[PDB]
Swiss-Prot record:
Induction: Induced transiently by TGFB1 at an early phase of TGFB1-mediated apoptosis. It catalyses: L-seryl-[protein] + ATP = O-phospho-L-seryl-[protein] + ADP + H(+); L-threonyl-[protein] + ATP = O-phospho-L-threonyl-[protein] + ADP + H(+). Phosphorylated on Thr-14 and Tyr-15 during S and G2 phases before being dephosphorylated by CDC25A. Nitrosylated after treatment with nitric oxide (DETA-NO). This is Cyclin-dependent kinase 2. Its cofactor is Mg(2+).
């Protein structure tokens, strides 16, 4: 826009490009998403009133010249970069726990307001120097499939808040192990990597699963792998919480509110991360 001076391109989505920009008038530094539907913009305009310390603030929405611009408060680094920067040593557990706890608070908040994110991934989890982490780039009603809930992969038409809990569980596992939990390269490979680790779901653990749009009786039948092998460095409270975030049945999957009460968070604190900007 004319009112903004692009500083640098900082990312892209399957619908828009995000720039670090400076308000030529106020000088405020922001994240500006450019997108090339009044019902959607109404859904967007609503996100503006979503104020929570763990949700990136949407400052303005401008529809002009066949372009939709979303102006957000700017954070200095995303979790993917932080994880890559911390790959040799690993993010300390207290910080992992703090981040998970904060993201659950953000989700408990949007979910109580009937807002789903739908596409959580390290690249849209933003951190600052003060130890906070916030949910960014909410999704509206080469793409990464690594954090996709099984019900989405199986063709469910209606998503529930449980899809965000699944994504956050995959991210939690990744911070702990320093390796993506389910790194699929195709929808079926994604689905099958999930099955190989958690076991091929059936009617016992997931009532209705065999009646899902994309379920095939011909899916291979893999046995559930021992959880202690999945995220070895994680203590039992962490593994217990993770298993509840990764339940196959959306209705059995733990809620963000309930997860916040899990014993894993008994000793949660808010450490300062070492950020190289
Ligand atoms: C995938 O699509 C997205 C669309 C929009 C947003 C968004 O709201 C952002 S991105 C941002 N700053 C930032 C992001 C990454 C880095 S990095 N890579 O660590 O050097 C540094 C700064 N601040 C806000 N508020 C995030 C993702």
């Amino acid at each position: 826009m004319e009112n903004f001076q692009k500083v640098e391109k900082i990312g892209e989505g399957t619908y828009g490009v995000v720039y670090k920009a400076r308000n030529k008038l106020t000088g405020e530094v922001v994240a500006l998403k450019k997108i090339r539907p009044s019902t959607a913009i109404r859904e967007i305009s609503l996100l503006k009133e979503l104020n929570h310390p763990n949700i990136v603030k949407l400052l303005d929405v401008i529809h002009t010249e066949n372009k939709l611009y979303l102006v957000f408060e700017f954070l200095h680094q995303d979790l993917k970069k932080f994880m890559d920067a911390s790959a040799l040593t690993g993010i300390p557990l207290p910080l992992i726990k703090s981040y998970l706890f904060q993201l659950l608070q953000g989700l408990a908040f949007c979910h109580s307001h009937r807002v789903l994110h739908r596409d959580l991934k390290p690249q849209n989890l933003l951190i600052n120097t003060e130890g906070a982490i916030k949910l960014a780039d909410f999704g509206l009603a080469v793409v990464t499939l690594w954090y996709r809930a099984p019900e989405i992969l199986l063709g469910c038409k209606y998503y529930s808040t449980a899809v965000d809990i699944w994504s956050l569980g995959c991210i939690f596992a990744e911070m702990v192990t320093r390796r993506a939990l389910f790194p699929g390269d195709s929808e079926i490979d994604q689905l099958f990597r999930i099955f190989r680790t958690l076991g091929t779901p059936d009617e016992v653990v997931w009532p209705g699963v065999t009646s899902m749009p994309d379920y095939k009786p011909s899916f291979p039948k893999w046995a559930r792998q021992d959880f202690s092998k999945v995220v070895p460095p994680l203590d039992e409270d962490g593994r217990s919480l993770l298993s509840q975030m990764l339940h196959y049945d959306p209705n059995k999957r733990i809620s963000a509110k309930a997860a916040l009460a899990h014993p894993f968070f008994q000793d949660v604190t808010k450490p300062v991360p070492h950020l190289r900007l």
